[PDB]
Each structure stands twice: as C-alpha cells, then as structure tokens.
Design an enzyme around this catalytic site. Structure first.
Site, PDB file in Angstrom:
ATOM      1  N   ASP A  48     -26.414  -7.745  39.820  1.00  0.00           N
ATOM      2  CA  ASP A  48     -26.861  -6.480  40.399  1.00  0.00           C
ATOM      3  C   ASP A  48     -27.803  -5.773  40.137  1.00  0.00           C
ATOM      4  OD1 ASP A  48     -25.626  -4.545  38.492  1.00  0.00           O
ATOM      5  OD2 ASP A  48     -24.360  -3.957  39.585  1.00  0.00           O
ATOM      6  N   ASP A  52     -25.594  -4.228  30.627  1.00  0.00           N
ATOM      7  CA  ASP A  52     -24.530  -3.634  29.823  1.00  0.00           C
ATOM      8  C   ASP A  52     -24.897  -3.650  28.276  1.00  0.00           C
ATOM      9  OD1 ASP A  52     -22.740  -3.816  32.127  1.00  0.00           O
ATOM     10  OD2 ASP A  52     -21.742  -5.448  31.166  1.00  0.00           O
ATOM     11  N   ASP A 101     -12.008   7.903  33.189  1.00  0.00           N
ATOM     12  CA  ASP A 101     -12.390   8.001  34.400  1.00  0.00           C
ATOM     13  C   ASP A 101     -11.305   7.922  35.679  1.00  0.00           C
ATOM     14  OD1 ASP A 101     -15.126   8.715  35.635  1.00  0.00           O
ATOM     15  OD2 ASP A 101     -14.492   6.711  36.612  1.00  0.00           O
TER      16      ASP A 101
END
Ligand code: AU3
Ligand code: AU3
Ligand code: AU3
Ligand code: AU
Ligand code: CL
Length: 129
Positions: A48, A52, A101
């Site tokens: 995409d 990283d 998260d």
C-alpha cells in the site's frame, strides 16, 4: 544495530516494556525476532506504499512520519527514521502506544502468526534480567 536475544530483552526491560499492557518480555522479544531479526535498521515497504521501520516494524500508515505515505498519520509524533536508532527508546515509546490502541499485540501480524500462544518464555530463557 543487530541485538542479541538477551541483550534485547534487557534493553526492553530497561525501557519498561516487560509486562507492559500484560505482555511478558518474551512476547516482545519474539515479536522483534520475527519482525526484524533484532536489527534496528530493518525497513520494509508495504504493498500500500507505507513502510515498516525498526526492531518492531512500526508502520508509517499510522504511527510515524516518513513524508511519502499519502493519507497517513503520525500518532507517535516522530520521524520514522528515529525508529532505526541503535537506542530503542523511540521504538519502545511508540510500541507502548500501539499495543494500547485496543488490539493489544495483534497489531503485529508476525506476533499473532508466530508468537501468540507459543512458549514465548524461551526467548528470555537463560537471560540475566
Ligand atoms: Au507522509
Ligand atoms: Au491485550
Ligand atoms: Au516471557
Ligand atoms: Au535503550
Ligand atoms: Cl537501547
């Protein structure tokens, strides 16, 4: 920097990652082993267009700024290059936000696929901690 296993365990404990959000130190060491093979300089481009970065392969789509990931965020408020340092402080600080998260360590797909549910204590077996 390429860390040794116990060397990394010790640094991660020093920076407060051991049992952070209930994840024992072997979970963190196991995640680092399959994300980066303990290499702080590891970088890997995602399909995409994000990248990283570092020992825990933190993704520019959400967590750091690398200036080339359109539409992305920078929730750790750091340049992605900081996540490549020989000092793991910035990667740990960001990893603490990621694991908080809501999905815990499942945010690291290699942890889910290769560490979750395994004997992760072997990663710290033998280490002076
Ligand atoms: Au960008
Ligand atoms: Au959890
Ligand atoms: Au453990
Ligand atoms: Au450190
Ligand atoms: Cl360090």
């Amino acid at each position: 920097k390429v860390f040794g296993r116990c060397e990394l365990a010790a640094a991660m404990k020093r920076h407060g990652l051991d049992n952070y959000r209930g994840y024992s130190l072997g979970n963190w060491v196991c995640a680092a082993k399959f994300e980066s093979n303990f290499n702080t300089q590891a970088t890997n481009r995602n399909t995409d267009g994000s990248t990283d970065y570092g020992i825990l392969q933190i993704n520019s789509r959400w967590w750091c700024n690398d200036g080339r990931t359109p539409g992305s965020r920078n929730l750790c408020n750091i340049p992605c290059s900081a996540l490549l340092s020989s000092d793991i402080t910035a990667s740990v600080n960001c990893a603490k936000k990621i694991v908080s998260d809501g999905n815990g360590m499942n945010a690291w797909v290699a942890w889910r696929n290769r560490c979750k549910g395994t004997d992760v204590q072997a990663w710290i077996r033998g280490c002076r901690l």
